[PDB]
Amino acid sequence: ALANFIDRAATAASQVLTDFHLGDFKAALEKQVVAVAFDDQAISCAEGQATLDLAVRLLARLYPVLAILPLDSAASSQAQALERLAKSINRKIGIRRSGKSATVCLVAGATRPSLRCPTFFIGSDGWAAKLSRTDPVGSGSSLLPYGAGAASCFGAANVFRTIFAAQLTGAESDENIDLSLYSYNKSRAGDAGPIDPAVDLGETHLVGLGAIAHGALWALARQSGLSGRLHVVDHEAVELSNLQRYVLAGQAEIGMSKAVLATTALRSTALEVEAHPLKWAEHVARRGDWIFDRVGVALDTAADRVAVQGALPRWIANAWTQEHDLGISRHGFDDGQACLCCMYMPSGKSKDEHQLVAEELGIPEAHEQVKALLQTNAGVPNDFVVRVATAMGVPFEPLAPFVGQPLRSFYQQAICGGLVFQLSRTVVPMAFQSALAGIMLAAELVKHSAGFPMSPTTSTRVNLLRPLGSHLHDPKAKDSSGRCICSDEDFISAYRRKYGN
């Protein structure tokens, strides 16, 4: 009952599991029965429905057999919804209505199932995400999805670290979580973040509509009280393998334009969503305005992210996932802090020609000999080519004609010409990472436009392959080389011309 996308999932787990074996992983999954139990308290509120929704959206993208366990009769209704939802993602998924065989369990609401397997109680209160291995935590009564949805992510993360504990180092189960998604600190009684969900997004651009963006769209669909205009931008369509992280893409959305999916998903919100089945550069070219109030970036390369900053939006919320980490960074351009381009600036310095050519040939040690060969423009000796060939892991015979030729001719054809590369790891994240970074990107865009005070640090990061960090803030300082565009007086004038100060 593994999903037809189960291979993209195995790729994702093969980047985080020590001693990954594909047939073993699939067989580990088939021994599992992951249970979702819920009662009248969970189903009687927006937060509880949200937490159950995202939990099943995550669990159904990995496990072949789920147990959907309503604990009283009030939940019997929600339990059919959840069964339906899981079957829309994986039509061959197994569904049990008994906990007898359950191997892990997530619980929302106030009622303990009396199951023998490891059980995580997940819930929320407004901005607070709540997990407990010992006691129910219940769902609050706000119209905010952020605490609710983050808890689904922590639960889904804990289900995974419990099943695959032997293949994971320092990946203990959380015993308690109580994380404010407003402050990213441990929630305190004194500072309860604002529950009012009346926030105007202005004209906000959400660029890139893949895995991270789906968590953002999940959250924005579930905060009634958002108004404003939202441009969603992406040229691609959903593919089968994408259903391993895209929490809003079931089997039906395969082949659908990502921009069209994003609009359908918000169709019952009060937002005026504009779908652009375009690349960012085409969206920018056609708008011809160059005034961007708020941009939320969930693209896939550093180059694409830096290009957004070049258009000089008023403020950016940037989101990412890597192997041991996920996070979001905020960016105004004229604020004394780092800009989006600072985050991806290249490290090092420009090297002299002789040092660069020696490095690209795999012989940094030979810089002095390289320097001379470029001065004298002399023919490279035989041992020089045997050393470059060895250093680069490449047969000698292809490089043999360059013996006695100038070093430049050699360097030109083997490097600039791409010869040695002919002679010679996409990071796939876990669904619960993509979802939580997406949820965190939504919370930034909403908080920024609500005018709440902004995080002290440039970034806020989370590692879901370990227990939650206790200090989730990550400082990054403005780049100081002078080579970043936030140092450039022309860029600073263009920004101040559009937005003041």
């Binding site: 920018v284 070049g310 258009a311 000089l312 430049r408 010409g417 791409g418 080579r483 970043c484 263009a494």
Partner: protein, 134 residues
């Protein structure tokens, strides 16, 4: 194609400044055989003729594109002098400061943001190399 994504107030300001710093040296370049034919954001078209070689022949004609310029390096394309169309067939300009170099994966280890702000990738630098090895 590279579309303009940088706020064009930025790129157009820097393009104009490059031209401004070209104008005092326009006579000096003419002696070496370098003539600015047309300048209009984002292109600069030049033609090249050897002054010592007689008959005095047009031996190169280029368009230097400054789209997204200076976040992105400028592009140098050899075009036909009259028709302004790219001609088919370091030669090609694999040098730092030129977009065609930085977009080569073999030169991924030398990204442009290491050279930004330093005089590489300005209009004089490109012209001075083309004349020197030309």
């Amino acid at each position: 194609p590279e579309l303009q994504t940088v706020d064009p107030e930025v790129s157009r300001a820097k393009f104009d400044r490059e031209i401004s710093r070209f104008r005092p040296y326009a006579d000096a370049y003419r002696m070496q055989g370098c003539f600015l034919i047309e300048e209009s954001f984002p292109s600069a078209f030049f033609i090249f003729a050897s002054p010592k070689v007689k008959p005095r022949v047009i031996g190169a004609a280029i368009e230097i594109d400054f789209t997204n310029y200076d976040l992105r390096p400028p592009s140098v394309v050899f075009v036909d002098p009259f028709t302004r169309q790219p001609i088919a067939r370091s030669p090609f300009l694999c040098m730092a400061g030129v977009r065609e170099y930085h977009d080569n994966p073999a030169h991924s280890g030398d990204p442009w943001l290491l050279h930004r702000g330093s005089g590489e990738g300005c209009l004089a630098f490109i012209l001075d190399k083309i004349i020197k090895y030309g």
